[PDB]
Design a protein around this ligand. Structure first.
Ligand code: HEM
Ligand code: HEM
Ligand SMILES: O=C1N[C@@H](Cc2c[nH]c3ccccc23)C(=O)N[C@H]1Cc1c[nH]c2ccccc12
Ligand SMILES: Nc1ncnc2[nH]cnc12
Ligand SMILES: Nc1ncnc2[nH]cnc12
Lengths: 389, 381
């Protein structure tokens, strides 16, 4: 009887199953939701090894006929987004866009967005949903600025993410319809009569007049927006649950705002926003711990396994803003380490700073056990994050 | 070990458990989510009997000390004042006249928006919620501009919790305050229940007025939106029903009536306190015990409805309990039906290739709510 993957949808405590797997079979054979078999790696040491060993391929997880943890919801070519981006001389436009340094006003503008969104929830009074009222509009607004598009249609863009990022046992119609719908949005914004200045679409319009089709440009835009928005909103929601359940943390923040950096780094270690594992196909037979992994097999990295490993993190179950060291995997590791890590931090640091200043009596409106955790999604997240203040 | 209540939040099929319960113990001792016990009544004969007998009270369900299927969220005096005329005149679709053509303009505008974006769309946030909110804002004579906020209030108000939670009261007072201010607007409200209430305290506190307004807005928007999502699933999964409605638009009344019998929007049971020792089938219910009517139990009862598991827009007869029965039979039934007839008519006209964007098995069913509903209702056309 293989343990079933994925683990619990509930994102406010580490699933007891992640603790058991890391302790008894840090490389366990598991059955994914497709019915394919996989190697789930749940210890820090072995997770870092997989991430840092190039014979475990990310690109190759989209190949036809390989074992899948769930259906492809995007074209095969996009699962190697950083690959293709690098190979087209597009890396510079993308890397300038992802660099927080490269946009001197980003900080002040993110800060202003966070303040106005919370000011709107304070105008109506508690309770409010901090997902629909804060994390979603805030993450959408960041990513509209990164692309250089307006914010008018954020709701329909974030609805695109509600479909794009579904984990299904089999392909579903409408995963592709969804992809081509918002690809179309990105192509229209890029080929606008007042041609787009500002953003990655600004840099893309500059770039296709030098000596890369419209479809690949739109593809990069759409794939960066959905990856960034889904990841930032989900992380921020779990960071918000941490501050609501542990108000001592929001007190430290208010008392000592400069510790927000180290604080977000700990919330990143602790956050359970990743609803699945980082996938790789073995390109060769590899001895990983006590298991022989055959070429062509699927390897699944359990970030929450590694980031809660008591071998590396003392008292891993307890949030601690004063860790001497924090070599966490929340951004992954090796060659596919998140290229937007600095931007992820800046996003969270600013939203969290604004929130503890604007809602100093922030708490869940109801017991944490009664939050609705989203099923069948790449991220764990509360469908609604009702709070009081 | 007692069977657990409530049953599955899955709303696309009748829970197997409801079938086993109706078959083997149609009056069943269950543990509610509060850990209290109750009698779950799952056959039509006994469901109909509890609803039509006044030895079972709904008002007493809110009394202190009684067993509960879940915690109160609203004040106890809301589960005599000569308002009955203002309220009943509002719940009459034939006192707003333009309602029909207005709701139809609403449905079409909401749908025209999604057709412009192109599929997929979420028919909950893009259709049922804006549409249901629109109805109830017109009912109260208030603008529709704060519909997201108002429907968010419903997301907290209609939670099923084992124990009470803060926020239930905060949420209640936040929106009471909202209704009190629309009641007391400088250009006094004219039109709607508020309009009528304004004229009816010139002839009952502002507290009580906004309290009726808010409970009415609450119960109707949550109920019409949830039912319309089930009817939409029915028409997506069974596109022959949508072909029927395009071919024969006049059957929408019979059709919406069968979709009512079939729908699993009601996610709890209709609660009664026994005001006395009453025998029900083979069970001696003692005074002050909680009785719970499982509507999907009665509406799928084959002793009354042939082939209950199948939707038939052509049944000779359809005496369904979707609106309840006896003294507490839904007072807004016709408004309920009108809401759904006009949205579904508009839906099968505008989106004739309507289908789910994925297998119905993979919809997210909302937990811990009075309604069974899909958190999202993603569709293609
Ligand atoms: C708190 C926020 C974020 C978290 C927790 C996060 C986490 C991660 C992780 C763990 C990976 C590695 C995937 C793997 O190894 O298979 C990754 C990669 C990636 N992330 Fe992030 N991410 C965040 C924000 C963002 C943002 C804002 C963007 C873009 C706007 C972004 C775009 C990407 C891209 C393009 C990759 C793929 C890189 C490659 O394959 O080489 N991320 N992210
Ligand atoms: C199609 C949607 C609707 C369905 C499925 C529905 C269902 C029901 C049911 C089953 C009851 C009986 C309660 C019980 O016996 O415990 C009820 C009662 C009630 N409904 Fe409707 N309802 C709908 C529409 C509405 C609307 C539009 C309104 C008003 C705006 C409304 C307001 C009420 C009120 C006030 C009661 C309580 C009556 C009493 O206690 O005597 N409902 N509803
Ligand atoms: O840029 C990418 N790089 C990798 C890894 C990755 C980066 N950020 C993520 C966030 C969630 C899951 C995977 C990733 C990938 O696999 N695809 C895309 C992102 C993406 C856009 N829409 C999607 C729908 C479905 C799955 C992935 C994507
Ligand atoms: N595969 C993945 N699952 C969840 N979150 C991610 N962030 C980046 N890649 C991811
Ligand atoms: N008890 C109840 N549960 C669900 N929906 C209702 N509509 C009216 N009363 C209801």
């Amino acid at each position: 009887p293989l343990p079933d993957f994925p683990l619990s949808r509930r994102g406010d405590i580490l699933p007891a199953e992640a603790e058991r797997l890391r302790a008894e079979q840090p490389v366990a054979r598991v059955r994914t939701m497709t019915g394919d078999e996989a190697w789930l790696v749940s210890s820090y040491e072995l997770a870092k090894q997989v991430l840092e060993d190039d014979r475990f391929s990310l690109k190759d997880t989209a190949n036809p006929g390989v074992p899948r943890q769930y259906a492809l919801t995007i074209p095969p070519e996009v699962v190697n987004n950083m690959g293709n981006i690098n190979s087209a001389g597009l890396r510079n436009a993308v890397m300038k866009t992802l660099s927080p340094q490269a946009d001197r006003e980003l900080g002040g503008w993110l800060e202003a967005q966070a303040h106005q969104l919370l000011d709107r929830l304070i105008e109506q009074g508690p309770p409010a949903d901090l997902r629909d009222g804060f994390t979603e509009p805030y993450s959408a607004a960041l990513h509209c600025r990164l692309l250089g598009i307006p914010t008018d249609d954020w709701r329909r863009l974030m609805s695109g993410i509600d479909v794009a990022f579904i984990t299904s046992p089999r392909t579903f119609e409408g995963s592709a319809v969804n992809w081509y719908k918002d690809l179309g949005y990105m192509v229209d914004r890029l080929n606008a009569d007042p041609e787009p200045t500002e953003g990655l679409l600004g840099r893309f319009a500059e770039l296709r007049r030098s000596p890369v089709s419209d479809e690949l440009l739109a593809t990069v835009a759409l794939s960066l927006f959905g990856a960034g928005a889904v990841s930032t909103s989900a992380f921020l929601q779990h960071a918000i649950i941490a501050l609501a359940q542990q108000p001592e943390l929001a007190d430290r923040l208010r008392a000592e705002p400069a510790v927000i950096g180290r604080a977000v780094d700990e919330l990143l270690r602790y956050n359970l926003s990743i609803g699945d594992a980082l996938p790789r196909i073995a390109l060769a037979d590899v001895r990983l711990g006590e298991v022989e992994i055959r070429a062509g097999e699927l390897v699944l990295v359990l970030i929450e396994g590694a980031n809660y490993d008591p071998a590396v993190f003392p008292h891993p179950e307890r949030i601690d803003f004063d860790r001497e060291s924090n070599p966490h995997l929340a951004f992954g590791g090796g060659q596919h380490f998140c290229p937007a890590s600095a931007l992820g931090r800046t996003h969270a640091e600013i939203a969290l700073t604004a929130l503890v200043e604007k809602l100093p009596a922030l708490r869940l409106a109801l017991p944490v056990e009664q939050l609705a955790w989203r099923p069948g999604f790449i991220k764990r997240l509360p469908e609604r994050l009702p709070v009081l203040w």
